Amino acid sequence: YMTPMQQKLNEVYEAVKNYTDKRGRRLSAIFLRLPSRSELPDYYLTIKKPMDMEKIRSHMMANKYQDIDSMVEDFVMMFNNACTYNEPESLIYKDALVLHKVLLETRRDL
Numbered sequence: 001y002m003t004p005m006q007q008k009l010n011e012v013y014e015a016v017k018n019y020t021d022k023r024g025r026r027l028s029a030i031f032l033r034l035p036s037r038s039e040l041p042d043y044y045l046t047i048k049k050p051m052d053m054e055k056i057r058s059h060m061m062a063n064k065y066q067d068i069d070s071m072v073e074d075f076v077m078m079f080n081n082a083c084t085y086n087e088p089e090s091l092i093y094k095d096a097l098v099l100h101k102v103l104l105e106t107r108r109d110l
């Protein structure tokens with residue numbers, strides 16, 4: 001049922017989604033869906049282009065993304081957003097760094 005390109009897209013998305021650390025913590029959990037403008041106003045003041053994994057998953061599932069590196073660039077913007085808005089001392093910031101590494105390892109393989 002999946003084409004090669006769909007399959008590659010899915011593999012990159014699932015690698016980031018399913019990653020768990022050695023304690024069983026799923027780092028992606030908080031990245032799935034951005035809170036509202038009233039819930040996280042300071043993020044929307046700080047970030048020009050909001051992104052979350054549900055937005056990427058929808059784009060993937062409408063068979064948009066013409067190539068793998070488009071999806072990589074949307075994940076990279078998401079993690080760059082997280083690290084612009086949050087302080088380096090925060091857990092989400094550290095989590096964004098780890099998932100960014102996981103994303104690139106997957107891409108390096110294809």
Ligand SMILES: CCCc1n[nH]c2oc(=O)c3ccccc3c12
Pocket residue numbers: 030031032033034035040043051052053078079081082083085086092
């Ligand atoms: C509850 C805080 C959620 C949050 N804080 N900072 C964030 O930066 C992000 O880039 C991001 C992306 C997708 C979902 C949530 C957040 C986020």
